[PDB]
């Protein structure tokens, strides 16, 4: 019942919103996971690993360049916008809204959200493999050698870019190879980020889970802690529930703006 949810919403002083891939799929943004989630011959599992990057950094950079380039035409959706405007409106009333996102597309930022924790990183940040520096980067193309590369067709030829001409670190002394600042399969989530997330979840008095489920990851890491404080959890996702907290079934860009208005 939306009315019962809205009664909690009206009273909540600290809302934590966790968002997963559903909220980014609705902006037209490929995940690369599942049936037809292919880029050339590969799926995301194959490419988003340090082993892929070590063995074929040009191929991995072609893949990330394609993804960066495709973001230009993909736009935040009504769910992202509702979330951002809710944060602004409630902030003026002294009420806090924070986003904990699995998504690396920066769409929440483009929507206007300020308090965002990107637990898997961002397509538009780099990390230097040598000095460790993390830097924002929205350049199209990220480096000249990648211009016009990254085609997703199976029979595309590899660019096979010499490593020296992949994106390099611009601290004059360093010049290290840059990688995407995205958490890859087999890597740890940042401890500092998780500590900040734990503090927000512990202080929150209403938690929303959008475009994913409480029962799987990453929600499963924190949602039980919230529930066990007696705090309501509201899921917005296209997933079904049997005859059995709150669940609003459907696309989040339809459900969420009504819930959050």
């Amino acid at each position: 019942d939306l009315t019962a949810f809205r009664e909690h919403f009206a009273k909540a002083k600290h809302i934590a919103i966790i968002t997963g891939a559903g909220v980014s799929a609705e902006s037209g943004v490929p995940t690369f996971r599942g049936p037809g989630g292919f880029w050339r011959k590969w799926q995301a599992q194959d490419l988003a690993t340090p082993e892929a990057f070590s063995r074929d950094p040009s191929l991995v950079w072609e893949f990330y360049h394609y993804r960066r380039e495709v973001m230009r035409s993909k736009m935040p959706n009504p769910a992202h916008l509702a979330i951002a405007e809710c944060e602004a409106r409630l902030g003026q009333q002294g009420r806090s809204v924070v986003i904990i996102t699995q998504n690396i597309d920066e769409l929440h930022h483009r929507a206007g959200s300020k308090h965002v924790y990107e637990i898997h990183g961002s397509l538009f940040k780099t990390r230097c493999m040598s000095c460790g520096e993390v830097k924002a980067n929205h350049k199209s193309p990220i480096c000249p050698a990648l211009d016009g590369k990254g085609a997703p067709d199976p029979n595309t030829k590899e660019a096979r870019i010499p490593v020296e001409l992949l994106p390099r670190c611009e601290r004059k002394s360093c010049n290290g190879l840059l990688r995407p600042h995205v958490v890859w399969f087999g890597e740890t989530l940042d401890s500092d980020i998780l500590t900040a997330v734990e503090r927000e979840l512990e202080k929150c008095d209403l938690c929303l889970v959008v475009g994913t489920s409480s029962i799987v990851y990453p929600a499963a890491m924190f949602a039980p802690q919230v529930a066990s404080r007696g705090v309501p959890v509201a899921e917005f996702n296209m997933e079904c529930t049997p005859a059995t907290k709150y669940h609003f079934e459907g696309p989040c860009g339809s459900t969420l703006p009504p819930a959050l208005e």
Binding site: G186, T188, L189, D190, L194, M221
Partner: peptide, 8 residues
């Protein structure tokens, strides 16, 4: 430190 997706 936490393993992205619990390693699954």
């Amino acid at each position: 430190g936490v393993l992205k997706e619990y390693g699954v």
